[PDB]
Amino acid sequence: MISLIAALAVDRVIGMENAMPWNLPAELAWFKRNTLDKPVIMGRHTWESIGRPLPGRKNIILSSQPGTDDRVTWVKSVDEAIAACGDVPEIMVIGGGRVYEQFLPKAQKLYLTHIDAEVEGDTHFPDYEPDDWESVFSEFHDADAQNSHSYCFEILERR
């Protein structure tokens, strides 16, 4: 099955011109826990943002342009992206905006992190119909010594 995993600020903002203005090691820990040992599909801008391949995951980059790193797999279509995953129970799509838009229709589950940050965004997570999804897990946490903002983890399954 295909799952989308994203960190959304207020109004579903997911990206800005520069790095997001938050320091959330706990959110990254959740991201790692939910993607480890699974293929991850991302767009080129997300790839460039991370800076290196994610350890212990098969990194797949969906892009019309040519491959710059021998450490990951470059694909040119959703179909190719999928085929590169092989036979695994779950494929994780990690962004950005355009990639989420192309995979939403095929997605069965969403792993969302809602962050209480008001920012002017560049890209936003596609509008989802809350009547179409069932929340099966939610957990709220306040900002603390290491995390700059409050956040809530949520997992939704398609009804």
Ligand X SMILES: CN(Cc1cnc2nc(N)nc(N)c2n1)c1ccc(C(=O)N[C@@H](CCC(=O)O)C(=O)O)cc1
Size of the site for a second copy (CB under 8 A): 20
* Identity of the residue numbered 45: H
Q: Which of 71, 89, 146, 159 binds a second copy (CB under 8 A)?
A: 146
Q: Of these partners, ligand X, Cl ion, Ca ion, none, which one is at the site of residue 96 (CB under 5 to 8 Å by kind)? A: Cl ion
Per DSSP, the three-state class of 87 is coil
Instruction: Report d(CA 35, CA 31) in Å as an integer.
Output: 6
Closer of 16 and 82 to Cl ion (Cβ): 16
Looking at residue 125, its amino acid is F
Position among 3, 59, 113, 147 found at the interface with a second copy (CB under 8 A): 147
Residue 22 interacts with which of ligand X, a second copy, Cl ion, none, CB < 5 to 8 Å by class: a second copy
Query: Please, which of residues 11-30 interact with ligand X by CB under 6 A?
Result: 27-28
Contact partner, 149, from a second copy, Cl ion, Ca ion, none, Cβ < 5-8 Å per class: a second copy
Residue 43 interacts with which of Cl ion, ligand X, a second copy, none, CB < 5 to 8 Å by class: Cl ion
| β-strands 2-8, 107-115 pairing | parallel
Which residues from 83-142 bind a second copy, rule CB under 8 A?
Answer: 117
136 binds ligand X, rule: CB under 6 A: no
Integer Cα distance of 1 and 89 in angstroms: 6
**∠ at Cα 36 (66, 125), nearest 5°?**
65
DSSP 8-state secondary structure symbol assigned to residue 67: P
Positive or negative torsion for Cα 32, 34, 37, 41: negative
**Contact in structure between 110 and 3 (CB atoms under 8 Å):** yes
Minimum distance, C-beta of residue 15 to ligand X, in the bound complex (Å): 7
Q: Which residues bind Ca ion (CB under 5 A)?
A: 135
